[PDB]
Structures are given as C-alpha cells and as structure tokens.
C-alpha cells in the first residue's frame with residue numbers, strides 16, 4: 001500500500017466572487033460529491049480573519065462519510081483563497097498523521113503547479129467559467145502517480 | 155518540554171439546548187476567549203449528520219491566532235454532543251501529529267472522568283446553569299499534571 005492507493009480522490013478548489021468552486025478533480029467522481037467536499041474544504045475558513053494567510057495543512061475528519069480529508073489551504077495572486085484536498089478512508093487516519101511531513105512536501109509542490117496553471121488559464125478573466133478543466137486534471141493525475149510511489153509508513 | 159508545557163489551556167464544553175456552552179476550563183482564561191474556542195470546537199460539527207457519533211480526535215489550526223486546537227469530540231447520555239479541547243501554539247503542530255496515539259489515549263481517559271462528573275452533577279436538571287465549575291476544573295487540572303509527564307517526541 002502507498003499514499004496513492006488510499007487516495008480516493010483529490011480536488012483543486014478556488015473561492016471566487018461566488019464562493020468556493022471546484023476547478024479540477026481526479027479521477028471520475030460525481031459532481032455533487034465533488035461540490036460538497038470542495039465547499040467544506042474552503043468553509044473550514046469561515047471564521048479566519050484573513051482566510052488562509054499561512055499555507056495550512058488541515059486534517060479534517062468527515063465522521064459520517066468515514067473519510068479523512070487532507071486539506072491544503074493556500075492563496076492565488078496575479079487574492080483568491082484556494083484548497084487542494086486529498087480524501088482517504090477514515091481508518092487510515094493514524095498513518096496519515098505519522099506521514100505529515102511528506103504530505104506537506106508534495107502538497108506544496110502540487111499547489112505550486114496548480115497556482116501557475118490557474119494564473120495561466122485565467123489571464124483575461126479571473127472570474128470566467130471553467131470551460132477547460134484538463135490542465136488541472138493532468139496536474140492532479142500527476143500527483144496521484146507520485147503518491148503511488150510513497151509506501152504507507154505502517 | 156512536555157505536552158503539558160505547551161498546553162496553553164483546556165476546555166470541556168457541552169452543546170445543550172442553547173448550543174455550545176463551556177462547562178469548565180483550565181487554568182485562568184478570560185471567558186470571552188473560552189467561549190470563542192468552546193463554540194468553534196463544537197461547530198466543527200455543523201454539517202455532521204449525527205454530531206460526534208465516533209469519538210473523534212480533530213487537530214484544528216486556528217491560523218490567525220497562531221494556535222493549534224486538539225479537539226476530542228464525544229457524547230454524554232443518561233444525548234449531548236461534547237468536546238474536550240487542548241490548545242497549543244501553532245509552531246508545535248508537527249510534534250503534535252507525531253504524538254497522536256498518546257493524545258488519543260489521555261483524551262479518552264479524561265473524557266470518561268468529565269462524562270461521569272457531568273452526569274453526577276446534572277442529575278436533576280441536565281439544562282441547569284453551571285453554578286459549580288470546580289469538579290470540572292479539578293479533572294482538567296489533573297489532565298495537565300499528567301500531560302506534564304509526557305516529554306515532547308522531538
């Protein structure tokens with residue numbers, strides 16, 4: 001088992017003028033599900049005076065669904081709050097906690113790629129509808145390929 | 155350094171018919187501060203279909219305040235959602251993650267004492283005003299004495 005084998009899906013979300021919005025996700029997941037966790041991922045920030053001013057890894061249990069959410073909170077400028085979420089089954093929570101250092105490493109690396117792809121794609125209008133999700137799926141697919149080379153520290 | 159030396163304060167809270175309420179805390183902390191984190195501790199459950207059906211440890215960053223909240227969610231019957239929160243400075247987050255097993259151990263042990271003290275004290279009226287906080291302060295003070303014997307795994 002690897003981090004990638006327990007990563008059920010991942011989501012890149014940005015809070016634009018209409019609130020949290022899924023930009024891309026991986027792999028094939030019903031949009032109603034994506035929208036739910038995309039929204040939860042960024043409303044963990046409801047009462048943060050300045051959003052995600054520190055790139056914050058937050059492990060968030062989704063008790064009812066038996067999921068643990070690995071949520072990386074960050075910002076995009078040239079300011080949008082944004083999140084990168086990896087979701088895993090709740091039973092693995094203890095291994096995920098032990099593995100926080102490598103998770104923070106890869107989440108930073110992938111977040112940088114997603115930031116650059118967002119600024120590149122939304123040059124003209126930062127509020128445009130997301131008519132091409134594939135640059136973001138490609139980046140998230142790459143994430144998962146790299147996660148699958150990290151064996152579970154357990 | 156021990157877990158107890160980085161534990162800035164702790165709170166035992168119960169969500170009764172009027173919502174989240176601090177029952178006791180340790181040591182001396184302005185009530186407006188206690189009420190803030192007491193409330194946040196239990197509204198992490200806003201969108202949980204059945205509250206804290208699984209005793210859930212949740213590490214929650216308070217980015218703006220530079221705090222990490224160690225939040226144990228549990229229930230009281232003879233059903234109230236309840237929380238036990240230990241707050242630490244955000245810089246220690248990485249050590250806290252490594253130490254999840256012993257934290258879950260002691261949080262379970264202390265939560266059992268607080269549950270028994272709550273059922274004992276609110277026998278007649280479960281919605282009564284909290285006119286005697288000291289049984290709960292004593293339990294939380296005991297927590298902190300035990301935390302101070304756990305050296306930081308780092």
Ligand SMILES: [Mg+2]
Pocket residue numbers: 058059060061212213214215
């Ligand atoms: Mg959390």
